[PDB]
Amino acid sequence: CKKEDLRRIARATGATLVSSMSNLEGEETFESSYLGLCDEVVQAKFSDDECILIKGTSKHSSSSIILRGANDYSLDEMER
């Protein structure tokens, strides 16, 4: 995964970005509040493109657009 994506996952699903597991105390543990929430997660494959479809974020909504065309260079015009 990349850095800029996981901030939007945590922002959408309601989780918080965890760079390391620690707290103000000396002990080391993990709390359930760091975890997000979503309704459904499904991995889909279409023409050698595996994509994990995360839908139904409870805290805040999100969106993505799956553009479809002839080839990658035609989709670059659609992406722009």
């Binding site: 970005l17 390391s20 620690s22």
Partner: protein, 192 residues
Amino acid sequence: SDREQLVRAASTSLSSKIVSQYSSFLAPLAVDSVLKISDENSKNVDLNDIRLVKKVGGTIDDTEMIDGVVLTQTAIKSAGGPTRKEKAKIGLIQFQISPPKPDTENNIIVNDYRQMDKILKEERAYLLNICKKIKKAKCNVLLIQKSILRDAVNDLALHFLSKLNIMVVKDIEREEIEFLSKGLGCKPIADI
């Protein structure tokens, strides 16, 4: 001080540049910049106190005198805890926030598997008690120098400061320490 003569003199002296027609608001900006430094002995006023920060974007009409000290560098955003601060206490760090080591190279040995638990706990403890002293002094904004020789920050130190809602920056020039200290009124810090 005479706004009738100095403002008109500053506007009619540029006279050739692109901002000559924008001089309706920039000529007072030049007069108000120099009038803050005043002396009866007619000293040679140093222009190091007047820093011109170049940012690519926008238009020249948006140029205006900022009341406080504007910083050129951007934030780190490795943790990204705080977004907007209000009534913050600014501090200037000159040392480096890292696990404990001298400036020179060292050798650490491990003769037993139980020693690693003490090493991993004490390395973050040296970062923890620094954050406690930062919390005791209620310092909300920290400025860390470049420090090419020793690592300025790491993911561990950024995580403890992310909980306390403290922003951090890097890549500060050594010559600009006079401008930040004299401008913001914050003395530097080189020891915990």
